[model samples]
Target: FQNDAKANFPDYANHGCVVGRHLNFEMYQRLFGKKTAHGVTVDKVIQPSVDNFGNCIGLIAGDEESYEVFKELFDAVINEKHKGFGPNDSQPAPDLDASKLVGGQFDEKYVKSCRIRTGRGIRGLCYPPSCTRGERREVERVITTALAGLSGDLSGTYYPLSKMTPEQENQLIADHFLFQKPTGHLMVNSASVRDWPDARGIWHNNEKTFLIWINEEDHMRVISMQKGGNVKAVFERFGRGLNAIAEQMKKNGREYMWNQRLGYLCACPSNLGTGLRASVHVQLHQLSKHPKFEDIVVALQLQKRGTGGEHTAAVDDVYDISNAARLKKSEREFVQLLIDGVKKLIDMEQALEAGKSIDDLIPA
Candidate 1:
């Protein structure tokens, strides 16, 4: 049925761990005959990559069964992506204790706002990439009902994409409080954008510190954000809000998807474990222009992108720096990694400013 759609899988490297890299002809033929009970085929799983070859990790778990029945493919992809992880290896239980985080606001000068977010999928539902319109509505209903129970700082209003007025939408976008419609080939080919604005929406507190994105890449993305460099504060609120949402889901006879081997299950392999991305928007006056900045970030195991979210360019020398690896680490450890790693970058930047060699600081 998807015959016209082509699979132009990139060969950036002769070989790598990501699905796009390992999805060579050999593996494709081996997996061609397989299909999940929900009718998801290898074509459906890799549709995003075929539609957009630029996608590095080009695969989506259409449903939970996509992970189980296709464990061979998922395992191979994840194994290569997460080298420390093996078939027998299991993701450890998350420890949400934020107090254990050593550094908070490392450098006020260079450090800016901090945001920490994690994705969750409702049990017994298809992932967004393979969800039906009815399923998406059901997913929205379950989460919005739980969201209504939030109180105090977490109290917020759900703004469904379908109901937004053009003026209201513009304001939200100007403030960077809105997520755009899925016009990208990734979500389009994966069928995540079907039904358009039907069940997709965002809920955020009046202060906009705590928020959630419903029916997006994952079933939900619980986020805690604030201005300045207080990584611990954002993380503390992140744990609290996530736990509250989980509690509400359990009471309603539903639960967020989880696998002992993968922690919180989601569509993306990189987000398979904790699904947490602890980040900060900082003014990298000097380091932003550093020739080795990209190299420095990769070596540190952190991801740096625009402060305006994915695919946007940095403004005012402000870039968001967050932990890259989400698997094989506890929530606390994950945030701590960003906390420490960001400080080290600042240290490196300061050294560079003094015309000092950062070679002593970089990994060998």
Candidate 2:
């Protein structure tokens, strides 16, 4: 029953993921007004499943490749190369809100920089609670405290550019902000490794992200540490890593340590898209009265445990998602099948205990 999922509170169970894709507009402009093969060729093979924001949420490879196939047409249309596109492209989508919160269109430069700096950019999923009112207030307090603490530390990283040009000033500020990025998600960063100079921490979901079980000899181990007895190590790693980083920051600067009141790169756009996330699921069980339960609970209380458990561990880029291009559609589909097959296997066990034959319940 205990597993190390390293998930958001409630889990990312219901929220969908975002997919990212890069389009080179110049490629279409040169070949305009000509009939071209719409399907795959040596150059433009389909890479389905990449979404508008570029997150690869649903299925892998095949789905992603297929999305790439569809995108050729989308790119053509948006760039006004396709027939009847001139007028349509000229007229923008109607009733668009320009005053929206950090509107991407309204402030293209800011949006561009934000995405370029983020781990996922517009291609990743956004979750809710961007920062609760309380969270925001807490962040402000942490930032003020950090600034005061930086009194001695500031001189090293701080290089003010009051006399620089507008362009130079923007770049300088971005550099400063990069050093400050870790401040946004302090708790998460407090527990894991920072990937970039500005990175404070990373997150992973076992169900959504893949895990490999390998030994020092490059041998396969458990399918996932979370699902096996190795779950204990998850907490240990965090405990050790978090404490180590905090200690190091106190002496050196918190290069990768997170604080608060900093701007972070927001990932893919969707309802409740933000670092604040939640996941949920449903389960049914019955409690029974038994003396053994009470007896087992009072076993000298020898265990020394921490506040959090396996479910809250932090995950890094997790090679599985990072090297996604290596996967073919069929390969990813098999992984999904394996997961679903395991679920069915559990159901079968329950059914068999009740004298039910799997064949009798439904046709295979």
Candidate 3:
């Protein structure tokens, strides 16, 4: 291992995360040897980057307390990644009300399916990476109770990973209803999955349209999904479902991680804002091959992932594209961004078909 005081990141790694983007020799010297009261150190959080050269968003919080108590380095990472988010500025309260959002029914001709999800961490708990099994059980106890109480369409069954049969578990994975365990070199070294699936579990509705993953990347991951591009519906479900879970947590004398500046606290700094990711599986055929495809998506504040998800490869012309910018914005704005961006992508594809250049369509 390299020396901590030197901040000697291997030159081969991208280190493209906020910490990598902003932390420099000067800053490194300043933060050298510093540790949060909770025993979190600069190296402890940044070790993921060292393990995987291609790892993105490499920093992970050891505990929630350090995010505030030892926010010196944390502050800079947020300010940079969530650009325009000022050091002195407090983020606005979350707005998950889907009624206030616009844009919908992503054209069926170009879109396959849509999904919207958000991550929530319980206040005062350490993140998955640094949390103990005791804390993990506590999160499961609280969240599973809240999930079981969801009424109407939100009602569903909870499958604890420890006791579920292989078929039940595999079926959920087969149907894309359950979260796969975290993998990769960085994850293996990271403490996020240290105890295997001890308190991990899946909860979803009978229809299988809504689901929650407990003790995954964060304390909880709640999602809403369906065929076709009716993103608005999925978003509404996410908002309502999360609201119910929050209420139940409150009844247990706990609260979601939220604040004016950060909005929502998560294990990773990148998802600290609204923690909302709204996306669609779209067929981009010609547009994906266009010279400006990368420029177009980046301009629209959207990201393209392979058909199999983040680390997978694209199959044919289909890909999962979603809102790329979640920080410094509300949940509504990010969803709207994806909706409008997807519509524009379709138009750009048609323009290419019509023997036209989409230079004008490029956002100025």
Candidate 4:
């Protein structure tokens, strides 16, 4: 438990959706009742459902609604206590006039591939750490049932980790698509894998472009990816697959764990809002070489990923660029932001290639 934890149940006891059931009141009070993991005591300061303590599960509101509830806490946590902040305000407002991105076009020469994915959890179940073997397997059973029915580009096969061949497993990893059994940080932080590899696996289409990591960080992580800069195509494919599976879930009467405050519930708090992460692997040799490269990345609100995984270093000049925040923005807006930011960086990289100095472009 964090040392500064403070309880705020009095503030939200009437709010039926604010409490998480995995832990008891004693555990919750000891770990998150008082102050946050960052030592900030969130009591009357902000609404309970808004995640005032930064625990990620504090509020379960929708994009705009969560943003409104979290605004004050967000400012306080970042030490920007009275500055006006709102959804899409911390970051540059995306250009409404920016045309939809179609097939490869802007900065395609530098783009390696585009991948957009989102996580989902089933309703009426505890997160992985707290779930029983029966609950875990049920999640896999439900998801695979729907996925197995997908056709065309969205169709694929499910390979349970418990039964995968060594060669097939290696091939999945080689393709940068296999997520493997949970380990290390996943176990320590999220209490992942109580039942070992019994019910976990990977699902992907024949083309290997559409994929899902079943029983991982969340119940399901649906991913749509392909080579080059076709963000629209990738995003659309993912949206279609997600909606298709969601519709199937509805028909089966398995509603996604959802809250009015949280559009989609997941294991982690940071992923509470849209739960979407739209990214592209692109070469940024010029930018990577710049002294202010880190600064530029921060200013753009972009996150970096290595060619292999989050921990692996970037291979060649390629880097994974994605939006830093998932809350307070529409899926379309989030994707557009990444597209625009990538284009801006590519512009600068091109200028650098032309022997133009980027000293003026770096923010002072």
- Which window of ten consecutive residues has the lowest lDDT sum in model 4? 59-68
lDDT of 1 by residue, 96-213 (tens): 8888889777677788788888999999889988889988898998999888888998888888988988987897776577887677666777888778788999888888899888
**Candidate no. 2 TM-score:** 0.19
Every model's TM-score: 0.87, 0.19, 0.88, 0.73
RMSD of each: 3.9, 23.0, 3.3, 8.6
For model 4, what is the error of residue 49's alpha carbon versus the real structure, in angstroms, after optimal superposition?
20
Task: List where candidate 3 sits over 4 angstroms from the true fold.
Answer: 1-43, 49-57, 311-313, 353-357
Please provide, for model 4 over 142-188, each residue's C-alpha lDDT reduced to its tens digit, 9 standing for 90 to 100: 89898877899887889998899999898898778787556644343
Give one digit per residue, the lDDT tens place, for model 3 in 1-364: 6666564533433555556665666666666677766677767787775666564656678877657654766787777777766678776678887887777788887899899888999876777887789988998999999787788999899999888898898898887877767886545667788787898999999878898999988888888998898888888888888888999888899889887778888878888888888889998888999988999899988899997877787777888999987786788878888889999999998888898998888777
Q: What is the lDDT for 127 in model 1? A: 90
Q: Pairs clashing in candidate 3?
A: 90-261, 91-260, 91-261
Task: Mark the regions of model 1 whose C-alpha exceeds 4 Å error after superposition.
Answer: 1-37, 52-55, 289-292, 309-313, 351-359
Cα displacement (angstroms), candidate 3, residue 247, comes to 0.9
- Model 2, 153-249: lDDT tens per residue? 1211221222235664465344332122223222122211122222121111223111211110011110111222121232233223323323444
lDDT of 3: 0.81
After TM-score superposition, what is the CA distance of residue 1 in candidate 2 from its true location, in Å? 64
